[PDB]
């Protein structure tokens, strides 16, 4: 069933979009390009604190009628970081600032075989939340996170 959503921009501006629950995130970001002029691969859509990811759909994030999305600049550029288990060995990961902490765990599970529900990442004495990105924590390049455990 058709649906209206609202996208607030950093420039004190709220855009109305005509969408469907089946619409993919990339399909929505394209609509935002036509209206706001921002390249899809540079848009970071936020909802309830969760980053809407490409390949998914609005329904996957339970986006209901008249929901409000926030648009910010998706920070781009490949770089490497390090993850040292508290034991501990160190592995090197190729990431972008816009990669979520949940994404980082999936990459750790890919080479260390560690299930995400067992992974707890630390940096600067803080616990990194799955929903947020590396950017949100100012994780510099060459930084070393601490996996627990």
């Amino acid at each position: 069933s058709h649906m209206q959503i609202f996208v607030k921009t950093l420039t004190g501006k709220t855009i109305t979009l005509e969408v469907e629950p089946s619409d993919t995130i990339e399909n929505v970001k394209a609509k935002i390009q036509d209206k706001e002029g921002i390249p899809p691969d540079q848009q970071r859509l936020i909802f309830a604190g969760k980053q809407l990811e490409d390949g998914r759909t609005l329904s996957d994030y339970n986006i209901q009628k008249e929901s409000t999305l926030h648009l910010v600049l998706r920070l781009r550029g490949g770089m490497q970081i390090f993850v040292k288990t508290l034991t501990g060995k160190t592995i090197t990961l190729e990431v972008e600032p816009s990669d979520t902490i949940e994404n980082v765990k999936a990459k750790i599970q890919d080479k260390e075989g560690i299930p995400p529900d067992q992974q707890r990442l630390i940096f600067a004495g803080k616990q990194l939340e799955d929903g947020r990105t590396l950017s949100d924590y100012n994780i510099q390049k060459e930084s070393t996170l601490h996996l627990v455990l």
Partner: antibody
Amino acid sequence: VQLVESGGGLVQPGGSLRLSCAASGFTFSNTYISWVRQAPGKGLEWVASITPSSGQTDYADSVKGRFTISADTSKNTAYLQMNSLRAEDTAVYYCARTWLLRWVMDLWGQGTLVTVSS
Amino acid sequence: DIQMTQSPSSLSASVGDRVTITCRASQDVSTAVAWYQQKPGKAPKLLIYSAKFLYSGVPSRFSGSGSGTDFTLTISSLQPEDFATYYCQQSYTTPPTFGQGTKVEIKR
């Protein structure tokens, strides 16, 4: 909402100098910060950019090697360390904010004059 | 480096006139072009981005067009405050590059 610059002034050839670019009303979260200079009677030239929240950097060839762009995320302030300065480094230095799309400067600071002379 | 060539380097016009500046890229840059306005002793301001998208706070008399290598900045009705220097820029690739500038002066 603006960018406030300082640190500019008078320095001799081969000398060093540091510029500061303090943010007001906005944070460096989800932004690139750039330095653009303007020589007297000249146009605009991009000096360097940075992703404050990752420390990633980019420099123009005519300056890549002598200058260093850094940021203090804690205080939403960007810096520009200028070493081995030259007469042709004389210009007005702007710091600009990008938060819409890469390389587009949606906010420019007041400006600070850098002059390299004996 | 991608070269951005503006034309003309200077143009004279009177208030209320319709003005059009052209920007040429040395190669294809799709719609990744931005326009800035600057004034003596002042910092530049963003006017147009992604070729034809108006930035916040910018009068609707400013308009952008074009894609590829040929772009244009149009001012529907020149106003006393519109008399300044205009720079185009490509945000298509690194390093970002500006045009030489086009100064719009008053006619008399």
